[PDB]
Design a protein around this nucleic acid. Structure first.
Lengths: 470, 470
RNA sequence: UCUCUCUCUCUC
RNA sequence: UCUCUCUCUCUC
RNA sequence: UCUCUCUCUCUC
């Protein structure tokens, strides 16, 4: 059944929206002030800090960073008769914790929290990619397209586990491997137990994310090493390099800024009644009638800023430029020639140069974001029955496709990773960059509500460049 | 997190400084005497001898060199009413070992020891380059710029492993190869095991230091030889010759003399509270308000001595003269016309000719010393994505950059070193001596604390000579 | 080398 | 990820 | 699945 999940997501988004309304009430902000991305970012990171129990518990035992008992940050921006001002106002954790407490009818709202962490992951992935950590681990910065949800902490649950990508998991595993190489953390203490439990859980998440059998079995053989040394390091690097083409269907949750949700909730559009979806038309239908303001530097182009924020909202920073432009309706500028900077504003930059303006979010078309992979993998490995069932009682043979039956079982168990690298490189060679994917699907029009008739895109515009980076 | 490392380095430097204060207390030296480079050198080499367990353990079984149970050296210089005197005072190992024992709150202070070895490496590299060992190994003395940390012993840890350079590792590997050629040390005894363990660890350090993939794979194929004969000898020589241009980002730790640290600690500038950094502005900000005295021969120019000691402190002996002068503010004299000698003073030279004077260390500007390489390598091999991730569930192809996918994996494994020498010489030909490096970075002013605005240097002063040697 | 291996971000 | 990993079905 | 999982029988 899908009605229950729809009601649950509608309920928790209604809670988030009415929390945002409560914030707009308590901050004494004007109508325009509540349509700002920056203040939503500030309050939302404040919520992240308040609800992150582990960092807090690390902090009350560590009274450092000067003024840090329980209050952090808070750069609220207010419009003064056309000009702008920034104030560093500090808020307690317990008060706003309880404001959430009645902002969700007595619940913890963990799903909402995961929504905020995921929307932060999308903003960071859209703005800045961490080539720095990649090169730190020795890992090639050519594969930044594997950095989905890198800024996410491990505190996120299964819903948060859905969005964090393959390459980010390679990075976090490499971090723990380097730590275990530096010192003997693998002893029989409770620390070793929690490390191996986390390691096996993360490997299970990995094997869930992949699609082809060969990579799944190689990963299953990865955690056989009770004492991970150096071989699994290049094993995981090659895992990422092979997942370049055999990508895992991780997630692309379409999280939206708190201002848009709050404006919708304030207008009386209760999400529980008509339902809410995070994947279909629904996150789209709020945006063509949404007004968003933000601050811009006197050199930044607002036209680029609108495209970038729509990227971040729809987590399309790692999507191809051609289809993103087709859905948007206008050409999208790659990261190479963007005359803009990060949407976050520095704490030291001067107050005079900021100017507020409206953000354009309307898009001509819409499409469903499925958590799947390209059809090319199913082209490499076709589909069909392998077994048969006797319906009539007739004296006949039972046809069994035996050579694939051994392949599923792997009768002769794989010796090491290398034998798997062999046929996975063979599959990579079988791959082609002209393999059309997602057959039977298309882009629909905004007037469509039940996905009745799509239109297939056709891109013949030479080599404009399907690479947002470079 | 960077606060913990900052606190740790501040703590161990505070320990070193208060050890230096304890030494100034116990030596009964005057105020000027503690501002001398020579006495700091003597006590510091004494500490090196006391804390070097391997040489000690080689020595108590070898009672040679006459008076050598546990006491070595100690040429302390004292000012007598304007004149100078030198005394050979001998100190025990255990007493000063325990003085360190409470000089660091009960710790071994291995990081501090590594700091002293690295600062010795910088002094030796600044003063004298070992062309002698290069020619001994048959290795061309044109490449002395690869002699970073040559005097370092193998006892230094990972922090010490960071600073010892590529050419020095070529030299130590050549030494072990010559030893294994002379006699069959590669037998199945425990000695062979420790040799191969050290050899593979040092090769791992090498492959960590390099940047380009081709050299890394060639090095990975280097240790495939279970019995190293003669081919890997020219293989490593060519490795150094290729690393001439494709240099490895080894390290340039800015270690400072114990007198400067001790003066700062005595004044009450506790490093733990405000933090310490070895790489940023911090090692610089102590020096413009630091007073240093040293002995000089009646022919040596003190102006050259100040520049040389600032070179040694900042380990800029292998940096280009133009930028070093720009940061210093005054022209730097190359090794060709330096009317000075080594900062260490001979044990046989007469007492009458020594004269003490102040050392100039103040510099107009400051810059960050990153452990990176020139941008020219990234110009030869550009940057960008290689793989893509499906965000929307659309029937579409997954574009994979296959020809580089084989290149990362090396599907057809390299036959020997020669096929790699081919394209590495091709890359050397692609190299140009006009490739501007370190884009997006610059030199900042001393008034800057957060690296807000740099100024890019522009050198058009013909051919003054960017070669400290020759 | 988490005081910056490149596309730039105060954000640890 | 039950708003679609492929053969297409409004059927939850 | 008593309209036949093997040695064959209309026998219920």
């Amino acid at each position: 059944n899908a009605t229950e999940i729809r009601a649950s997501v509608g309920k928790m988004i209604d809670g988030i929206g009415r929390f945002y309304i409560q914030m707009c009430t308590e901050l004494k902000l004007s109508d325009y002030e509540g349509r700002l991305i920056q203040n939503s970012l500030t309050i939302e990171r404040m919520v992240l800090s308040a609800f992150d129990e582990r960092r807090n518990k690390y902090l009350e035992e560590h009274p450092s960073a000067g003024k840090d008992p329980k209050k952090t940050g808070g750069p609220i921006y207010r419009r003064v008769d056309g000009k702008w001002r920034r104030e560093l106002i500090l808020y307690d954790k317990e008060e706003i914790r309880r404001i959430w407490r009645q902002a969700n009818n007595g619940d913890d709202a963990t799903a909402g929290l995961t929504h905020m962490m995921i929307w932060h992951s999308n903003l960071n992935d859209a703005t800045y990619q961490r080539t720095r950590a990649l090169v730190r681990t020795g890992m090639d910065p050519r594969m930044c397209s594997l950095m989905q949800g890198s800024t996410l902490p491990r505190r996120s649950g299964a819903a948060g586990a859905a969005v964090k990508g393959v390459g980010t998991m390679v990075m976090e595993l490499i971090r723990m491997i380097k730590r275990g190489i530096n010192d003997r953390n693998f002893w029989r203490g409770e620390n070793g137990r929690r490390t191996r439990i986390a390691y096996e859980r993360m490997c299970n998440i990995l094997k869930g994310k992949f699609q082809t059998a060969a990579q799944r079995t190689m990963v299953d053989q990865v955690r056989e090493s009770r004492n991970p040394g150096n071989a699994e390091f290049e094993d995981l690097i090659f895992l990422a390099r092979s997942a370049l083409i055999l990508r895992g269907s991780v997630a692309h949750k379409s999280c939206l800024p708190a201002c848009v949700y709050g404006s919708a909730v304030a207008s009386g559009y209760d999400f529980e009644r008509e339902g809410y979806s995070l994947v279909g038309i629904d996150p789209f239908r709020l945006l063509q009638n949404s007004q968003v303001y933000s601050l811009i530097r006197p050199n930044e182009n607002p036209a680029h800023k609108s495209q970038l924020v729509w990227m971040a909202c729809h987590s399309a920073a790692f999507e191809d430029l051609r289809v993103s432009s087709f859905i948007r309706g206008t050409k999208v500028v790659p990261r190479g020639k963007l005359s803009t900077r990060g949407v976050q504003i520095a704490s030291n930059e001067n107050m005079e140069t900021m100017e507020s303006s409206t953000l354009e979010l309307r898009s001509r078309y819409w499409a469903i974001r499925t958590r799947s992979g390209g059809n090319t993998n199913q082209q490499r490995a076709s589909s069909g029955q392998i077994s048969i069932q006797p319906t009539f009682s007739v004296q006949r043979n039972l046809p069994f496709d035996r050579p694939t039956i051994m392949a599923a079982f792997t009768g002769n168990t794989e010796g090491r990773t290398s034998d798997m690298r062999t046929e996975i490189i063979r599959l990579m060679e079988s791959a082609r960059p002209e393999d059309v994917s997602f057959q039977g699907r298309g882009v629909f029009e905004l007037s469509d509500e039940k996905a009745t008739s799509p239109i297939v895109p056709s891109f013949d515009m030479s080599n404009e460049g399907s690479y947002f980076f470079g």
